[PDB]
Design a protein around this ligand. Sequence first.
Ligand SMILES: CC(C)(COP(=O)(O)O)[C@@H](O)C(=O)NCCC(=O)NCCS
Ligand SMILES: CC(C)(COP(=O)(O)O)[C@@H](O)C(=O)NCCC(=O)NCCS
Lengths: 30, 79, 79, 193, 204
Amino acid sequence: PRPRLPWFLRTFAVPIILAWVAVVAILNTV
Amino acid sequence: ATQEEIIAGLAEIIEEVTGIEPSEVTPEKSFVDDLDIDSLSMVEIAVQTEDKYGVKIPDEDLAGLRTVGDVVAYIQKLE
Amino acid sequence: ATQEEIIAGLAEIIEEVTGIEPSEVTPEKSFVDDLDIDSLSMVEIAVQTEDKYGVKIPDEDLAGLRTVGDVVAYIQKLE
Amino acid sequence: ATYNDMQIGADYDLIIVAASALILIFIIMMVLTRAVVAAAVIVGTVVLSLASAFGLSVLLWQHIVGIPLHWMVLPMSVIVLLAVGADYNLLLVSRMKEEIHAGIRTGIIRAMVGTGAVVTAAGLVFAFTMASMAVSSLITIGQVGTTIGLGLLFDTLVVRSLMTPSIATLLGRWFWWPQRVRERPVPSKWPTP
Amino acid sequence: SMKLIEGVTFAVITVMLLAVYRSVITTLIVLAMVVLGLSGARGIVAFLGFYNVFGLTTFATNMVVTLAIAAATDYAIFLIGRYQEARRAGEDRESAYYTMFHGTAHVVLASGLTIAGATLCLHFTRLPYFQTMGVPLAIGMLIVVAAALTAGPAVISVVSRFGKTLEPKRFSRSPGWHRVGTATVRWPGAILVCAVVAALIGLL
Ligand SMILES: CC(C)(COP(=O)(O)O)[C@@H](O)C(=O)NCCC(=O)NCCS
Ligand SMILES: CC(C)(COP(=O)(O)O)[C@@H](O)C(=O)NCCC(=O)NCCS
């Protein structure tokens, strides 16, 4: 009965971290 | 105190507060449905009971009580 | 209430408050020395006891109590 | 004349900012905690702390350093102080509501013993981060940072520690109006060993 | 002076985190979260201001940097603190993580929304500095909140899996907090009077 949102965060952690890193890098480089 | 005396006193108080005749008031009746008595009328009954006989019923207890006999049992418990 | 039940409840409360395991808590133990419990921890125990079982202990009474069995006797005295 | 206009605008904007911030924060707190009285208590405690924060900053700069506060420091300090104090009180109240099913007083004690260290660490970090702006060559920025730091220090060390739990203890069941809360649970029988 | 401010703030934060968590790796992780949040807020503010969406001053930029750093650190502290409380209570890492999210997700989001909305009240001012300080601060705070609420749980998920990284180090109670709570509960009147008197000192 795990809640959906924390489970989603826990499962796809690496893609989320990489997405945040890429977005921040683009915004601070362009 | 005997159940009959308590029921008679509660019947008088209820009749004064809401208008339900004493005969309709029986220990198995429910305030919410059988007697259709809201919470405010119930606290009015509690205030009358405290000021007349000294039996004190807090609001939290008033929440729990459902039937007339349930109230009588609570009063007997205090005794 | 029997002494065993009161001692068990007090042991649970003390374990929550200070950290003393229930087995070490025996009626002859002294809070100040045997259990090394300060006055503030004692009033914490009193608050827990009041909020869980309804037994009320004023600060003046808390001053007098020295051993665990002494507290139990006080609770039995109220009964 | 330019600076006269600046001063008038500063007073007007200060009043507007204070009112709007109070209203919005009160609304958010009432929505989240589902209780009016809790939000009112939080707002009042934060404002009372804000007054003392203003006093401390005024002393430390004007009397000790000698440089009076710049005319634009006040609203910038006020808004941040209100927001952060409200957030800390909100965290404490939320933990209290979580732990209150075991009685008001035990719930308060457990909520304090739980949150206290974390909230203290966060408050000290925020205060020392704000106070670190004094290294700026510009002194208005340093004044703003130090004022916010002093406010956060006083709030964390007084309002959270004492004022909010004391008011909660005093108000009792009224603290969570309109939600119905038992002051103490049903007195249980002693456990059977 | 902005750059020196940033450096000093980072040094102070590192020292305080080392003092509190009594470990180096946890401090590094919190610093990584802080860097991510600060960089996100600074980047978005600079990018929007560049294309003439709004004007910027020195005050707005300094406040953006400092507030973003502080908010990121506070959110990381909240999450890790609740997670460690659950972990020390006895729960395993999975249940402790879920308990942490359940008990702190709403608090962090509410705090962030309060901070963001508070600065948005500046947009209704008159003086140009106050009016220009409104929107960028709100946008930066929103970016910081999003980063804390998404990356925070994600990093906690990944890090805790590997080794004994986020486990508590100082397994201890809070006897001082117990005493203070007892004093507050037993005698609220005197403590409230003392607090009110202390607060009124600032009116002099
Ligand atoms: C008053 C009442 C018994 C009404 O209950 P009901 O909604 O079941 O009629 C219940 O809401 C309650 O105890 N509320 C808390 C105290 C309160 O509301 N007092 C009146 C405010 S003026
Ligand atoms: C509080 C206490 C039980 C502490 O006793 P101890 O010094 O033996 O621990 C005792 O000093 C006492 O009753 N003091 C009077 C009331 C009081 O001090 N309240 C706290 C002031 S905030």
